[PDB]
Ligand binder design. Structure first.
Ligand SMILES: Nc1ncnc2c1ncn2[C@@H]1O[C@H](COP(=O)(O)OP(=O)(O)O)[C@@H](O)[C@H]1O
Ligand SMILES: Nc1ncnc2c1ncn2[C@@H]1O[C@H](COP(=O)(O)OP(=O)(O)O)[C@@H](O)[C@H]1O
Lengths: 343, 343
C-alpha cells in the first residue's frame, strides 16, 4: 500500500512544493502555501515512517540519523526529478520532510535582470557577487549566468555547492559539481583544490567565512572569474560588509583588492506583481573609473551619489512607472523611503 | 577501449596542456586555452572514470580520495613524461584533471634575464629571491639557475619542492629532490634536516611561513646559498614584506640580516609580445655599498632612488624602445604609471 516512490506521484500530480511524512497523520503535502493531508489513498501513517524513510536512506545516512536525530541529504528518482530530504527523530519516532529540486534552468531573459548582466559572465576574471535575503532569486540568477557561459564558452566550470540546487548538462564546456558534505567537507578544502584543478570559473554557494571569502578573493585575483553569494541587501553595504570583516592591519588594501577585482554586484528582493506575483527589485553596481578609485579612498557614501549602474530606488520606481508594484511595497522593500517619495 | 595510458597519447599528439575526465562527457582536452572533447575514439565516459583513475592510483592515494573527496599527486609514464593529477568526488562520482610536467629545462639564455643573474649562482652563500604573480617564470628562472650550477660546480644540491616541477640529471654535482607531501611532510621539518645533510645549495619552493622563512634565513646566514620564492611583485616591497612579518622586538636586526644576506632579487611578470606572445618584465636589485647600509637604516624609499640594478620602468620601457610591448600593457603590468609616461 504505502510507497514513497508513489507518494511522490500524487504530490507531483497536485503540484506540491513540499511533502511531509509524520507519525499521526496520513502523508501530507504543501500546496499553494497550505498543508493538505492527502488521504487520497494512504491512511494515518504508523511509526513505520521509518520504513519509507529507509527506502531512500543509504548507510552513511541511516547511521547519521543515529549519532544526531537527523540527516540532511538529496536523492534521485528516475521517475520525475531530484528531491531534498531531512529525516529526524521527531517525537520518539521518525519524521521526514522532502522538498523539491529544479529539473530545468530558467532562460536569463525570464529572470528580469537587464541586458548588462549577461556581459559580466563574458569578463575574464573578477568577483561577481549576487546578494539578497534568502528567497530572492540568487540561485536562479547564478545558474542562468553559469549556464549562459556553459553555452557560449569552451571552459571547465567548477561549482562548490551546499546542496547542489541546479544541475548542469555538459554543453560547449565541462561542468564539475561538488556537494559540500557529500563530495568534500567544506568550501575551503574544496575551493583550495579548485585552485589546482584548472577550472576556468569557480563557484562558492555561500561565503560567510573569513577563510572562504579569503580564497574566493585570492582566487578572483589569480586569474579566475568567481561567483559569490552574500546575504546583504544593497551595493554600498555589500562591498562594505566584506572589507569590514578583515583585521584592520590592511582593511584598506582589501578595499584596494575589492576595487581591482570587483567585476559586478546585483542585490535582489522578490516583490509581488499584480499578476501572478513575482517581479524583481534590485541594485546593480558596475564599477568604473571613479568608483574604482573611490572604493580605495573609501569615499564610500559619495560613490552612492555617482550612481545615477542603478540605485535601488530608480528601480523601485521604474517598476511602478508602469503599473506592477504598489507604492507601499515599493517601500516595504525599499532600502530607503527618503531617496524615493520624490518620484 | 578506454585506457588512460592511451588517452594521454591523442592529447600529447594535439599538444594539450590539460586533459579532463569527467562523467557525462567523453575525455576532454585543453588546447590553445580551449576545452575540446576528444570524441576521436572514446565515447561519453561512464561513472567508471573511477577505473581509469585507479589505473594510476596507489593506495595511500586511493584511500586518501576517501577521507576527503580528493587527492593531489604526480605519476610517471615511461612513454612520454611525467604528469600531475587531482582526482576528486565530483557529483557523486569521480573526476580527474591531469596536467603536464616539464621533461626539459630551458637554456638560461632563452629565459630573458640579463647576464648578471648567472653570477648570483656563482656566489658562496646568501638569499637569492625570485618573486612574482603565480604565472611569471619563477619555476623556470630557478631551474635554469639551479641547473647552470649543476653544470659548472661540484656540489650536493638539495631542493624541497611541492610538487617537484622540474627534475634534475646528476651532472658535475649530486642533486636530491624531496616532494613535500610524499617524501617529507613540510618545508620546515625538511629544511631543518637539509641543514644537517651537507647540502651546498638549498631550495624552498614556497616561503609563506614564519618558521620557513625563519630557517630559509637562518640557513642563508649559516654558509649556504638558498633560493626562495615569494609572491610579491617588486624589489622594494619584497625585502619589505619579509622583514615586516617579524615580531617588532628586532624588526631592525632582521633588516640587518636581510642586508648582509640578501644576494639578489628578481621580480617577474610575463607580458605579451607582438610575436608568439611571451616576453618578460622585471625588477632587479643587486645590493651594493649604499643599499646595504640603507636597508639597515631603513631609508627604504630613498634606496629606490639609487636604483638608476634596474627599476621596473627602465625595463617596462626598454622593451618598448624596440617594438614589443605596447604602451598600455607597459602600464597594465607597470608597478607605477607616474615613474614612466616620461619615456
Ligand atoms: N528573477 C526571478 N523572477 C521570478 N521568480 C524567481 C526569480 N528568481 C528566482 N525565482 C523563484 O523564486 C524561488 C527561489 O529562488 P531561489 O534563488 O532558489 O532562492 P535563493 O535566493 O535563496 O537562492 C524559485 O521557485 C525560483 O523559481
Ligand atoms: N622567462 C620566460 N620567458 C618566456 N616564457 C616563460 C618564461 N618563464 C617561464 N615561462 C613559461 O611560463 C609557463 C609557467 O612558468 P612557471 O615558472 O612554471 O609558473 P610559475 O611563475 O608559477 O612558477 C611555462 O609554460 C614556462 O615555459
Amino acid at each position: 500500500e504505502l510507497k514513497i516512490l508513489e507518494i511522490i506521484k500524487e504530490a507531483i500530480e497536485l503540484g506540491a512544493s513540499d511533502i511531509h511524512l509524520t507519525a499521526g497523520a496520513p502523508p501530507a503535502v504543501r500546496i499553494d502555501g497550505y498543508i493538505k493531508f492527502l488521504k487520497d489513498f494512504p491512511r494515518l501513517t504508523p511509526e513505520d515512517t521509518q520504513k519509507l524513510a529507509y527506502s531512500v536512506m543509504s548507510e552513511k545516512h541511516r547511521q547519521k540519523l543515529e549519532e544526531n536525530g537527523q540527516v540532511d541529504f538529496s536523492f534521485g528518482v528516475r521517475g520525475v526529478g531530484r528531491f531534498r530530504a531531512n529525516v529526524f527523530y521527531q517525537r520518539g519516532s521518525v519524521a521526514a520532510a522532502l522538498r523539491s529540486l529544479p529539473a530545468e534552468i530558467p532562460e536569463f531573459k525570464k529572470l528580469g535582470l537587464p541586458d548588462k548582466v549577461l556581459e559580466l559572465c563574458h569578463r575574464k576574471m573578477g568577483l561577481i557577487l549576487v546578494t539578497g535575503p534568502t528567497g530572492s532569486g540568487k540561485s536562479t540568477t547564478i545558474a542562468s549566468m553559469i549556464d549562459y557561459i556553459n553555452q557560449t564558452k569552451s571552459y571547465h566550470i567548477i561549482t562548490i555547492e551546499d546542496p547542489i540546487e541546479y544541475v548542469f548538462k555538459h554543453k560547449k564546456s565541462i561542468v564539475n559539481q561538488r556537494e559540500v558534505g557529500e563530495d568534500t567537507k567544506s568550501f575551503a578544502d574544496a575551493l583550495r583544490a579548485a585552485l589546482r584543478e584548472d577550472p576556468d570559473v569557480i563557484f562558492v554557494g555561500e561565503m560567510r567565512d573569513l577563510e572562504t571569502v579569503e580564497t574566493a578573493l585570492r582566487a578572483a585575483e589569480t586569474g579566475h572569474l568567481v561567483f559569490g553569494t552574500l546575504h546583504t541587501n544593497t551595493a554600498i553595504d555589500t562591498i562594505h560588509r566584506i572589507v569590514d570583516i578583515f583585521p584592520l592591519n590592511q582593511q584598506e588594501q582589501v578595499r584596494i583588492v575589492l576595487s581591482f577585482i570587483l567585476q559586478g554586484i546585483i542585490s535582489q528582493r522578490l516583490l509581488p506583481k499584480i499578476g501572478g506575483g513575482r517581479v524583481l527589485a534590485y541594485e546593480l553596481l558596475i564599477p568604473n573609473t571613479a568608483i574604482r578609485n573611490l572604493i580605495r579612498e573609501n569615499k564610500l557614501q559619495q560613490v552612492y551619489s555617482l550612481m545615477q549602474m542603478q540605485t535601488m530606488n530608480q528601480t523601485l520606481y521604474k517598476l511602478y512607472k508602469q503599473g506592477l508594484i504598489t507604492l507601499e511595497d515599493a517601500m516595504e522593500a525599499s532600502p530607503d523611503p527618503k531617496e524615493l517619495e520624490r518620484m
